[PDB]
Design a protein around this ligand. Sequence first.
Ligand SMILES: Nc1ccn([C@@H]2O[C@H](COP(=O)(O)OP(=O)(O)O)[C@@H](O)[C@H]2O)c(=O)n1
Ligand SMILES: [Mn+2]
Ligand SMILES: [Mn+2]
Length: 269
Amino acid sequence: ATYLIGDVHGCYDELIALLHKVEFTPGKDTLWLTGDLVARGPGSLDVLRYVKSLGDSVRLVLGNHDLHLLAVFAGISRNKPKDRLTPLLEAPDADELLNWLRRQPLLQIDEEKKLVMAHAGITPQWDLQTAKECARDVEAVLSSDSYPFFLDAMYGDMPNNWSPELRGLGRLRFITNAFTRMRFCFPNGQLDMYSKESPEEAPAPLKPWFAIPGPVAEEYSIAFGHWASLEGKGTPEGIYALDTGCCWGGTLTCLRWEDKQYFVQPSNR
Ligand SMILES: Nc1ccn([C@@H]2O[C@H](COP(=O)(O)OP(=O)(O)O)[C@@H](O)[C@H]2O)c(=O)n1
Ligand SMILES: [Mn+2]
Ligand SMILES: [Mn+2]
């Protein structure tokens, strides 16, 4: 079976309980994870250890908090106490875990299921070939020996409009924001980097990225996490918002792809 779970945010106990609920069995089943494995919840260390151990039985995409952890580890960014990353950063296997983490994709595609996953979704300004090329470029920088230079370069809110003519720092910044921070779009598809509330309580003319017709969403189902204030609600057919805010006292959601059956684990907090 194929299971897809939204942002775990260090909620190891809930993750394992949800996987036991569905009798998740590596070798017979595959797990897709929307990223943001770490931060806020208490068990980022255990989460990364487990997910790395799954190997080919897990398909991960990196989220914005995974990238932030990598930046903290590399000495690029400051550790925020509320993220609760210190046990992971101080672990004897921190190098192994984080060097594995930075090698993981930004984008997962399964052609037989016509299914795409990224942390925040797929901007309507991208077709599939462009999304793939952009994921490859940023994955290449993250898996290289020079990844701390990219992590430093990644921070920024501009440019927020895609063009194939974008080059250099702006190109990588837009790519990173589209895959890991996107929520609202302007009517022309341009990213808004500030509003993080639910679609109903957002100011006009902002609309969810998935409310703007785009070439990937026309052909593929898209699963994503990231947007906790969405509460997994209000998406169009073929769009699966899996982040139901476990670390926030919400729930951890798992979708089984074959029958579109949902399973939910209450937050322990
Ligand atoms: N149900 C919720 C959950 C979070 N939030 C807020 O949304 C902001 C972004 O958090 P998020 O969980 O959606 O995304 P990430 O920061 O994990 O990437 C936080 O500052 C939360 O306070 C909200 O307004 N409503
Ligand atoms: Mn998140
Ligand atoms: Mn996120």
